[PDB]
Symmetry: D2
Subunit: 251 residues, 4 copies
């Protein structure tokens, strides 16, 4: 227990699914947490379901909103003190091949999945460097930052960008002794509310030709690797990709 | 010889350096070539230096210009017939860490390096599929689509995006029997005019801790792998990354 | 705490350095542990330094010894009950290029680093499958399972073999619902007794051109990722590579 | 044409299938070739089918035979002059999971696929370095040097070892200015005599969940990438992996 003692974390898209599980385990391990999402109804209920305002609060923010990122860090500092930990988890998907992606779809997805992660990573470095916080930026990528999917063209682009941009940030932070690590987490298929709302999705994701374990994961599978990466347990890990995918990318 | 017999190729950024070498070898192997760039002075001289208008022409185009991509394919079809081959080579770099990248720099680089490659790949699939051309899309990435560089944050993002987006397109084209392959080429450091204009750059790039061969490459090093990928010699290669880097990524 | 409640672990080469740290943290998290090594003087002192015989014991064994692997699993079962967890950590290095490796050096290194990991993985699957133990095989690889080093030819061969052989085992175990996961851990440079016995080694390993963090790691850096992989926290992770290297492979 | 002018090549396992196609294209591009295999009936017919003894000869040799490697290089030098090019292509497969691999199977496969490639690579460096030959060692790996297959445990081990050992050799040769490059080729499924002798194999290999192109390749697909790597066209490529797999590893 207390694996995140003293840590102050921002988790984008932390009001449902994977992000909510990360927030729940972060609080359980002693972190103070600010979760974000676009809808305040979901967000305020999510925060209250996890802990008191002394442990966890909600901040309404679209991760594509550059100016809002400043307000998000400001509000987290005011509530909890200097931010030590950022999980860039908010993301969207378009079910389109590259061939069939409209430019509006392309720009919308990249605004959230790529611009948003860049805005959070850039600001995180500027706010967390040189403070002795054992700071950690955890950028959510995907198995689809490693392998293509024919119907996830823009998603693939964004997750490949997050994968390699994070290595750049890791190196710069390491070479400059900033006390900031940057790593990526790559979930396979995980049982989320979106998955349960798509008839047949889970069965398709569980075929052995997709997930060799024959079933999909659960949100706490991603929460636990994020606890390790936020914790000083992982103080020598930077610039690395952490895959939790039921074997998807091993075949 | 005649390794590209009958092929019709568009090469973006084909008026100098690597792109010009690709265009030169493509013409030598029997392809008809349309090269692009932003400046007509450079472009018309480059075309004339390689061959006659029956072999190679110039089309003025910024690869970030979505509507211009349609006009580029139209003009190439009018000159040479249906396009079989696209080399998405135009790209720019910003010498900034993620931390120090302005949003204007971020958007400018991504417009050329990511949006431009998406526009060309998407249009290429739509124009080249199902025509029996043995079509090939060659997306220029970089060693910096594999590894970070602390001073190339936005570049890293764009080249990681190109790397994985290209796998998505490769899979969709393969699964749908489009007769279009998509692969990425990843140059290491190559002696180009930009390199020769930066005092000390080549020596820095040639340190054994960067390039184990102790020297950088030349534009024809990238031309030759592009000839292989454009040719029916590589008819079973799709979704793959081809690295020509003097050992940079092997250590 | 109790992150390894009920687990029974074998750690090869667990009497010094990284393996001893893994064993120490495993016991702290509630596992029962059998550590191995070739020298009983080191091994019995190591076990006693960590806990009582009810928590941790030593078994003298060279990991290249195929028949001894059976006796090792037998003795662990007798002391602690069915084995749930195997860390294949024992390994040796030869400071030779491929060109300068003698065949005797080649065979000696592969006997420990490759045959030994195969013997333990094969036996582990046979002993741990279908017992509801949440079983986990953690194969120690290296950054040198990803990148070459000109003076580690045989080592590179063995660590690349361990990396991909482990994916085969992961897939078979997943597809057959064996309740056995297989993953690899890839340390960068870690401060060990061998390192401290080589004058100048740590400084060389800490150059930014090798480790961007500017220093090497410590044994607990590898212990903590092994706790995560042995624990049911990582029940959806199989067939994956976990790198803890101070940024070495990110550039 | 003449892409291998003046080159002198050894191709192991060059008497059937992929190795024979490599030998055929090498001769077509002007190389002198010594092919090997265990059976002289196959080997002498293969050589005669490709060219005259002035172009191509056969040498009977099991690639696991260390002393025979010396005799093989000696005989090639005597026939054709100093060897510039080595394709380590001979290899075998066992259809067994790690769990079900006998130690005899393990040692037999590794003797050919790993020891043999080490013996040829080590000797090749010693014989080809510092002679101004533009020397190239092409080590045949596999898609199964990248991803696991549950029924190819020992094969996976050997191909992962070849993949990373080759990077070590590439780096040492580059750093020491030996004028020797080392790269790996990774075929997907290819229509060979062994494949045609297994009922149902090709259909299984052609399922979209295995090969997205929906069919397997042919031996000339691997010959053409080997011509590029043997040729001075690839003089800046070393330490790299070249995949020709119909999309297998892209998903
Ligand atoms: N037939 C259909 O139309 C259909 C059916 C089922 C599912 N879907 C999928 O549903 C998706 C939309 O669902 P969703 O995005 O609300 O998923 P979600 O599962 O709610 O997203 C997970 C988390 O990310 C947050 N989040 C999402 N976008 C964010 C942003 N820009 N900035 C910050 N946090 C963000 C969410 O909170 P907030 O949402 O409150 O921001 C939530 O906390 C569509 O893109 C579509 O693929 C479509
Ligand atoms: N101190 C300095 O300011 C300094 C000094 C030296 C170098 N530099 C670098 O020089 C860079 C600009 O040089 P450059 O881009 O002209 O390089 P370049 O070497 O000319 O670019 C190579 C090729 O790509 C083409 N190209 C470039 N951008 C393109 C686009 N958007 N669409 C299509 N083709 C394109 C070029 O033609 P066109 O250029 O005609 O389009 C040319 O054919 C700066 O980004 C900077 O990093 C700066
Ligand atoms: N100039 C020199 O000669 C010099 C100087 C300094 C270091 N070295 C290096 O020292 C190395 C030998 O040291 P070491 O192997 O004893 O290292 P070590 O640091 O003791 O090895 C770490 C752990 O692995 C165990 N282990 C080693 N080989 C094993 C095996 N085959 N089976 C099971 N467990 C095994 C060790 O216990 P056990 O050792 O008790 O088995 C120990 O628990 C040489 O290979 C050399 O590279 C050489
Ligand atoms: N039911 C069955 O038993 C069955 C049925 C069909 C196929 N098979 C498979 O057939 C395999 C044996 O076929 P094969 O190895 O002869 O295949 P192959 O297709 O003949 O091998 C390709 C090339 O490699 C050469 N080669 C093979 N081993 C070599 C070595 N150790 N050193 C040098 N060159 C070597 C071969 O010549 P040489 O062979 O003349 O050396 C040939 O030139 C078995 O391992 C099995 O998987 C088995
Ligand atoms: Mg929502
Ligand atoms: Mg795959
Ligand atoms: Mg210019
Ligand atoms: Mg010792
Ligand atoms: Mg590197
Ligand atoms: Mg045979």
């Amino acid at each position: 227990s207390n694996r995140l003692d003293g840590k102050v974390a921002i988790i984008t898209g932390g009001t449902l699914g994977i992000g909510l599980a990360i927030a729940t385990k972060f609080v359980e391990e002693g972190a103070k947490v600010m979760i974000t999402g676009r809808h305040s109804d979901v967000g305020e209920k999510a925060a209250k379901s996890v802990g008191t305002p002394d442990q966890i609060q909600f901040f309404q923010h679209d991760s594509s909103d550059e100016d809002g990122w400043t307000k998000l860090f400001d509000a987290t500092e005011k509530a909890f003190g200097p931010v030590s930990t950022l999980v860039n988890n908010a993301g969207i998907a378009v079910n389109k091949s590259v061939e069939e992606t409209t430019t509006a779809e392309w720009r919308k997805l990249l605004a959230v999945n790529l611009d948003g992660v860049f805005f959070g990573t850039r600001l995180g470095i500027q706010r967390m460097k040189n403070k002795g916080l054992g700071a950690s930026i955890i950028n959510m990528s995907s198995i689809f930052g490693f392998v293509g999917d024919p119907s996830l063209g823009a998603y693939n682009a964004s997750k490949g960008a997050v994968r390699i941009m994070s290595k750049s940030a890791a190196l710069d932070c390491a070479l400059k002794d900033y006390d900031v690590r940057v790593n990526t987490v790559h979930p396979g298929y995980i049982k989320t509310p979106l998955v349960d709302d798509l008839p047949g999705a889970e069965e398709a994701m569980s075929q052995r030709t997709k997930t060799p374990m024959g079933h999909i994961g659960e949100p706490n599978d991603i929460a636990y690797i994020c606890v390790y990466l936020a914790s000083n347990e992982s103080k020598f890990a930077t610039g690395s990709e952490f895959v939790v995918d039921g074997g998807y990318t091993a075949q």
